[PDB]
């Protein structure tokens, strides 16, 4: 697939020789041509594991931009603005930065709503929130909030709800004496409230339980009732002797006769009753010297060791090639085992493994090319560790293919 090409680059960028070997194996049928790359393809869901939570900082994050005049060195920042304000989204599509620099647009961003929060559409990038009463019509006019009975209902709690002039109300904004100083204050309030409420809605769709939740959360008291208790399981062991004896195989232990026990207790008691330390009983030069011979650097107690010396021929060349071979073979066996160690037998995994392993039969052919160096360029060397693993990789599939009782 075309999408896999971009993600697979990680493997080739990190291991170029392994990628070359992977591509070589791809061409040499040691692995599938796609698998050479597709074995590394993986992606996330967005600019991050979770959509960037630009509910905070928004454009305020960048003092205008990367600079008093705003420079043009911010992307994700302006993308957060695009996500924050759909009006800017609409205008950011209009003010195309092609063959120019956003320097001017980033400078204009400090205009009104986005930086000074004025009222009417003085924004430098459209404004549907300019009609902030019509922008709020689908929130608290024609539509409503989701808790509006359980809470946030202080608009209709008093005796003023039934009738207005019924109260002693006189504080509210009159039709006489309206002001533009107040319009600036109201704009800041409306801009901050609408911004906060709208931006929050992006992360908070929307819930039918809100009202009932707020009722139960405030009516129930965890002090007088409503406990909190655990639900683990009591671990009553069965035949604990098993752990006492431990997971060890049967020893060669054997009892004697009660007579031998009785005599043992007696003989040792009698010996300890009749015992005194003596230098002759402590040591003899014959014993010490004989023990020194056994412990000597050429004695019976000097068992086999230090046999893992440096390699018979071209360790450096072998190690250099083995690095690539270990990465490649390891990455190959990885998938083969992933397909082989499945939870259940099915043709989707069996055929994918049998093809992958059949390609690995050309990797053993590619290892035969890697075997020529050890049998030609190298004077004497054994790479049998990989060879034994490679043999096991085929053996396991042959053994599994013989399990035709629905296992194969």
């Amino acid at each position: 697939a075309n999408k896999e090409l971009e993600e697979k680059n990680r493997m080739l960028q990190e291991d170029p020789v392994l990628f070359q070997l992977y591509k070589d194996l791809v061409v040499s049928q040691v692995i599938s041509a796609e698998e050479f790359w597709a074995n590394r393809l993986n992606v996330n869901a967005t600019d991050s594991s979770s959509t960037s939570n630009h509910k905070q900082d928004v454009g305020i994050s960048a003092a205008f931009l990367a600079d008093g005049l705003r420079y043009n060195l911010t992307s994700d920042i302006i993308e957060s603005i695009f996500r924050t304000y759909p009006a800017v989204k609409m205008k950011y599509a209009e003010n195309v930065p092609h063959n120019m620099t956003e320097k001017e647009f980033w400078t204009r961003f400090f205009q009104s709503h986005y930086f000074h929060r004025d009222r009417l559409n003085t924004g430098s990038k459209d404004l549907f929130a300019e009609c902030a009463k019509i922008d709020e019509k689908g929130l608290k006019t024609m539509v409503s909030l989701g808790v509006k009975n359980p809470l946030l209902d202080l608009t209709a709690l008093e005796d003023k709800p039934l009738d207005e002039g019924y109260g002693i109300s006189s504080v509210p904004s009159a039709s006489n004496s309206k002001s533009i100083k107040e319009n600036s204050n109201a704009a800041i309030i409306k801009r901050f409230n609408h911004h906060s409420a709208m931006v929050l809605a992006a992360g908070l769709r929307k819930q039918p339980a809100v009202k009932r939740a707020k009722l139960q959360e405030s009516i129930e008291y965890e002090d007088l009732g409503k406990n909190n208790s655990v639900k683990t399981i009591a671990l009553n062991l069965k035949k604990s002797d098993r752990y006492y004896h431990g997971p060890t195989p049967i020893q060669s232990l054997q009892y004697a006769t009660s007579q031998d026990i009785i005599n043992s207790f007696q003989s040792i008691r009698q010996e300890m009753e009749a015992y005194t330390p003596k230098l002759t009983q402590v040591l003899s030069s014959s014993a010490a010297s004989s023990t020194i011979t056994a412990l000597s650097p050429g004695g019976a107690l000097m068992q086999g060791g230090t046999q893992q010396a440096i390699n018979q021929m071209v360790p450096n060349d072998i190690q250099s090639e083995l690095k690539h071979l270990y990465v490649a073979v390891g990455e190959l066996l990885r998938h083969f085992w992933s397909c082989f160690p499945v939870n259940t037998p099915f043709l989707e995994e069996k055929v994918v493994k049998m093809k992958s392993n059949l390609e690995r039969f050309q990797v053993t052919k590619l290892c035969p090319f890697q075997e020529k160096i050890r049998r030609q360029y190298l004077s004497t060397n054994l790479v049998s560790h990989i060879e034994e693993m490679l043999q096991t990789a085929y053996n396991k599939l042959h053994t599994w293919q013989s399990r035709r009782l629905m296992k194969k």
Binding site: G203, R205, N228, Q308, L382, E388
Partner: protein, 366 residues
């Protein structure tokens, strides 16, 4: 206008020299907690979440929260493996309204602690995104086998977190995924984390002092309890024997562990794939079969049958020997401990060291 007069002798006569005797309990401690004979999540995949936000620069503790946190994290990482080599660790940092997986799923303190050392240089920036953090974690835990206790430990420094969507999405998912999440907060209690922890099955605690911080971390060292909702599995496990290059390295080529760059001539082979591994226990990166050393298994069996607290008394009123059983020595301290079963004489060090470190009472073995 009180600090130069805050000494105990400010309004007392005997406090002119008994001040450090009147306020003598100034710096001590005495750690002990309960236990229970319940199933434990011995197979453990614990992931650490640490605030990477500017709030980590505050000096609520002796050094900035970052230094004290990383200091105790390293210690916690060590003991976590030390008390459970079977388990694995991973770390994620919540920076710039984003989350960065400082360390992947692994059991190698070498790499984990190495990452911590390097993480000391991190830049505390932006606000935390609890949602992004849990996303990366759960995305990883999704692939972990149900029987392996999938757990996350969160260290929260700030109070406000930037989530791109209501965390109830994740909590509902985590609850359904049976993943457990615990949180440790700095200086405050946050409803978000409290609801998150209590609903998810973990616990929310607040740091008071570096000792309290250790005290809380200590609790998280012990494996969590498990319910019947988790997979009661019968996991396949390998116990490969170490194999040197005995025959002059004949037919046994040296090899680097799957996974490490160290080419080892001898070590543990995989009974499943014959791969080379210099260390044990190691997960077969190319098979899924975990390889564990037989002693590492027994290393955790104390959690299955741990000791019980001994009968404490200010004097050996039972008139046992003047010499404390177990470790021989005089009852120089006017506090004695007696095992409920074997009823031998034990001292302060016996009650502490035998119960917290030996986990076996000598008289009970008799």
């Amino acid at each position: 206008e009180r600090t130069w007069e805050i000494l105990k002798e400010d309004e007392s006569g005997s406090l002119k020299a008994t001040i450090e005797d009147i306020l003598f309990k100034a710096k001590r401690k005495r750690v002990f907690e309960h236990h229970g004979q319940v199933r434990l999540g011995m197979m453990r995949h614990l992931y650490v979440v640490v605030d990477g936000s500017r709030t980590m620069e505050d000096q609520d503790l002796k050094p900035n929260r970052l230094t004290c946190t990383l200091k105790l994290l390293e210690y916690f990482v060590e003991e976590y493996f030390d008390q459970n080599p079977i388990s694995q660790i991973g770390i994620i940092v919540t920076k710039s309204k984003r989350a960065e997986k400082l360390t992947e799923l692994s059991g190698n303190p070498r790499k984990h602690i190495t990452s911590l050392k390097k993480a000391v240089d991190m830049t505390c920036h932006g606000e935390p995104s609890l949602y992004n953090s849990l996303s990366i974690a759960m995305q990883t835990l999704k692939h972990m086998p149900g029987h392996t206790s999938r757990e996350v430990l969160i260290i929260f420094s700030s109070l406000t977190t930037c989530d791109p969507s209501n965390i109830y999405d994740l909590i509902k998912t985590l609850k359904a995924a049976k993943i457990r999440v615990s949180v440790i907060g700095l200086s405050a209690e946050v409803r978000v984390c409290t609801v998150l922890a209590r609903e998810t099955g973990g616990t929310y605690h607040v740091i008071l002092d570096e000792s309290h911080y250790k005290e809380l971390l200590t609790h998280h060292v012990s494996p969590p309890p498990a319910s019947s909702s988790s997979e009661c599995s019968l996991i396949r496990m390998g116990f490969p024997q170490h194999t040197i290059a005995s025959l002059s390295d004949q037919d046994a080529k040296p090899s680097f562990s799957m996974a490490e760059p160290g080419l080892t001539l001898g070590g543990y082979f995989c009974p499943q794939c014959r791969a080379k591994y210099c260390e044990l226990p190691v997960e077969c990166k190319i098979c899924g079969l975990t390889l564990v050393s037989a002693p590492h298994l027994a290393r955790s069996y104390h959690h299955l049958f741990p000791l019980d607290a001994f009968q404490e008394i200010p004097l050996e009123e039972y008139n046992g020997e003047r010499f404390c059983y177990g470790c021989q020595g005089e009852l120089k301290d006017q506090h004695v401990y007696v095992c409920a079963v074997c009823q031998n004489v034990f001292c302060v060090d016996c009650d502490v060291f035998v119960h917290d470190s030996l986990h076996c009472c000598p008289g009970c073995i008799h």
